[PDB]
């Protein structure tokens, strides 16, 4: 029989860029992140370097730490 | 005033596959998910064609669902 499948994924990525505050550092990222919530689809570059692409049906996204660097 | 952030993304994917039961359908999904958790990059497609790369430190998976197709 076919059967579909629904995954929940929880990834964690990591982004870097300049800012003079780690707010205005957010509000860079946020306005990457709100332009991907309607992407039809993801790619994944596995650890053998081969490229699978997937369905993306849904996303949202939060951010959990923001770091200035030395 | 460089800064890193790190950036939860929950994502919702679909597979579809043939089986004899919902049971080995979920093998089989589970098999590509565990094949994606040492993944470097994930990448979406935005709707102007363009493609948004992102370096992964962290995934997690799970089965949300599985249903039956007719």
């Known amino acids: 029989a ?13 982004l870097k860029n300049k800012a003079d505050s780690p707010e205005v550092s957010e509000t860079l990222v946020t306005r990457i992140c709100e332009n991907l919530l309607l992407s039809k689809e993801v790619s994944f570059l596995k650890a053998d370097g ?10 949202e996204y939060e951010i959990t730490n923001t770091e200035e660097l030395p």
Not at 2 to 14: H, K, S, T
Not at 50 to 59: A, H, P, T, Y
């Open 50 to 59: 081969s490229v699978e692409n997937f369905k993306l049906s849904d996303m």
């Open 2 to 14: 076919g059967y579909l499948n629904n995954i929940a994924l929880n990834l964690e990525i990591v």
